[PDB]
Amino acid sequence: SPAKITIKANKLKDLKDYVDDLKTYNNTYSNVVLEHHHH
Amino acid sequence: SAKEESIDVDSSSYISAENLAKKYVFNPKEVSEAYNAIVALQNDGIESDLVQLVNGKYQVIFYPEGKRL
């Protein structure tokens, strides 16, 4: 099903950190695709 | 049918960023735009529809592209 994900924190710093981690891992998993071509 | 998931980073139990990324493929442009909006609000007070104070917490909303393989 379609999904809507709401991420919440009282402090902007904590929200920033979660999103920063998400960004890192989302990019890493997407890079695995390219690695399969490289290797 | 549709799924709404709330991730309360201030709570005693929430899905890790690692596990969220394992579960879903996100459009990187969506995530980057939200991250930059958070930074702009924090650093320069720039308000955006992307990062709002709602019911006592700042929030962003993501619409995953897919379920990760």
Residue numbers in the entry:
A (entry chain B): 9 to 47
B (entry chain A): 245 to 313
Task: Quote what the paper states about this structure.
The HID motif interlocks with LID in an arrangement reminiscent of a paperclip: LID α-helices α4L and α5L and HID α1H pack against a β-sheet formed by insertion of β1H from HID between LID β-strands, β18L and β21L. To identify residues essential for the interaction of the SLPL and SLPH subunits, we analyzed H/L complex formation in an enzyme-linked immunosorbent assay (ELISA) with a panel of individual point mutants. Mutations of a single amino acid within LID (F274A) or HID (Y27A) in SlpACD630 were sufficient to destabilise the H/L complex. Loss of SLPL also resulted in partial degradation of SLPH: N-terminal sequencing revealed truncation of the HID, indicating that this region is unstable in the absence of the LID/HID interaction.
